[PDB]
UniProtKB/Swiss-Prot annotation:
Organism: Saccharomyces cerevisiae (strain ATCC 204508 / S288c) (Baker's yeast)
Source organism phylogeny: Eukaryota, Fungi, Dikarya, Ascomycota, Saccharomycotina
Coiled-coil residue windows: none
Subcellular location: Mitochondrion matrix; Mitochondrion intermembrane space
Marked site (Transition state stabilizer) residue numbers: R46
Name of the protein this chain belongs to: Cytochrome c peroxidase, mitochondrial
Encoding gene, per UniProt annotation: CCP1
Residue range from the parent sequence: 71 to 361 of 361
Top-level taxon in the UniProt lineage: Eukaryota
GO molecular function list: cytochrome-c peroxidase activity; heme binding; metal ion binding; peroxidase activity
Primary role: Destroys radicals which are normally produced within the cells and which are toxic to biological systems.
UniProt keyword annotation of ATP-binding present: no
PTM notes: CCP1 precursor is processed by the rhomboid protease PCP1, which cleaves the N-terminal hydrophobic transit peptide. The m-AAA protease (composed of YTA12/RCA1 and YTA10/AFG3) is required for CCP1 maturation: m-AAA protease promotes membrane dislocation of the CCP1 transmembrane segment within the transit peptide to ensure the correct positioning of CCP1 within the membrane bilayer, allowing intramembrane cleavage by PCP1.
EC number of this enzyme: 1.11.1.5
Transport found in the keyword field: no
Subunit structure as annotated in this protein's UniProt entry: Forms a one-to-one complex with cytochrome c.
Length: 292
């Protein structure tokens, strides 16, 4: 069976990775005009999720470990349309710190983005190791958005995610927006789309949603406030188990933050065996916590 053992970049410690975090965070601060002033935070979170979400628990293929998004098959996956923006953002960071692995860089970008957008601390472990082009997973492992709750549940079980983890992870859809040219969907999930909050759940419960076709002829749910939900988003209030958890997170942002942090770390670590003597997970300071 395929095993991927975490191997710390030789000679590196917490402080080295904090420097990489800081470079990402400083560039996030600088590049604030991207995507009509949203900034790069959301697309970096999506990149970290898409490089991880190719994992298959049945044979340990895909996942974040190998950094295989750098290869054309995966870079050009139609499911990844738009993520090239995140890759280009990270290019100068990788040039500044060439010692970091691709998987560590892509995953760290997501952690940095969540924290810099005032989200929870996400513990992060190093040691993903670049693997060759023939280890790149085929396209088609990332999820469709036109589906229902049953599809969502079945999909996420391939990643060993349970209902609470699924609902918590989807809270990231308060970030950024859908772009018609990338995915055939258009619009934001809420008003505060570059600050990490529980707005996704509040909006799911409190907005007046109308099912409509968009200009790409796909169905999405649109509110009078100018927000949208993907069919897979809206499925979280159609399924009774998911709905219960949506209510919990709409009522308690702190609980959402706690559960999101665990689920996101788990997502980014699926497929990786951490030696029992590996470093403990790192918790990076924000720029603000460092006075930078
Ligand atoms: C059923 C599972 C999911 C589906 C079907 C889905 C689908 C989508 C779609 C269609 C887009 C729009 C892409 C575009 O037009 O640019 C999007 C954006 C996004 N996705 Fe998801 N997603 C899923 C789960 C997740 C998860 C688990 C996370 C992270 C924890 C995530 C984070 C994001 C973020 C942050 C964006 C905004 C990107 C930007 O503004 O550039 N998604 N997703
Ligand atoms: C990126 C995004 C925006 C809104 C929503 N409901 N889902 C995902």
């Amino acid at each position: 069976t395929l095993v991927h053992v975490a191997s710390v970049e030789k000679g590196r410690s917490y402080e080295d990775f904090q420097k990489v975090y800081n470079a990402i965070a400083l560039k996030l601060r600088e590049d604030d005009e991207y995507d009509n002033y949203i900034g790069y935070g959301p697309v970096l979170v999506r990149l970290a999720w898409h490089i991880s979400g190719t994992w298959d628990k049945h044979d340990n293929t895909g996942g974040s470990y190998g950094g295989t998004y750098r290869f054309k098959k995966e870079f050009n996956d139609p499911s990844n349309a738009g993520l090239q923006n995140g890759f280009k953002f990270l290019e100068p960071i990788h040039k500044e710190f060439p010692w970091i692995s691709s998987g560590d860089l892509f995953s760290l970008g997501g952690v940095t983005a969540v924290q810099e957008m005032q989200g929870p601390k996400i513990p992060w472990r190093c040691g993903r190791v670049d693997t060759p082009e023939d280890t790149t997973p085929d396209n088609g492992r990332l999820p469709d958005a036109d589906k229902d709750a049953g599809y969502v549940r079945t999909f996420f079980q391939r990643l060993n995610m349970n209902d609470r983890e699924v609902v918590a992870l989807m809270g990231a859809h308060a970030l950024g927006k859908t772009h018609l040219k990338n995915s055939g969907y258009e619009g934001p999930g809420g008003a505060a789309n570059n600050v990490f909050t529980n707005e996704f759940y509040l909006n799911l419960l409190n907005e007046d949603w109308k099912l409509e076709k968009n200009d790409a002829n796909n169905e999405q749910w649109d509110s009078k406030s100018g927000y949208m939900m993907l069919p897979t988003d809206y499925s979280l209030i159609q399924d009774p188990k998911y709905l219960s958890i949506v209510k919990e997170y709409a009522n308690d942002q702190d609980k959402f933050f706690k559960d999101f942090s665990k689920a996101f770390e788990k997502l980014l670590e699926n497929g990786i065996t951490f030696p029992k003597d590996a470093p403990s997970p790192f918790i990076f300071k924000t720029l603000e916590e460092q006075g930078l």
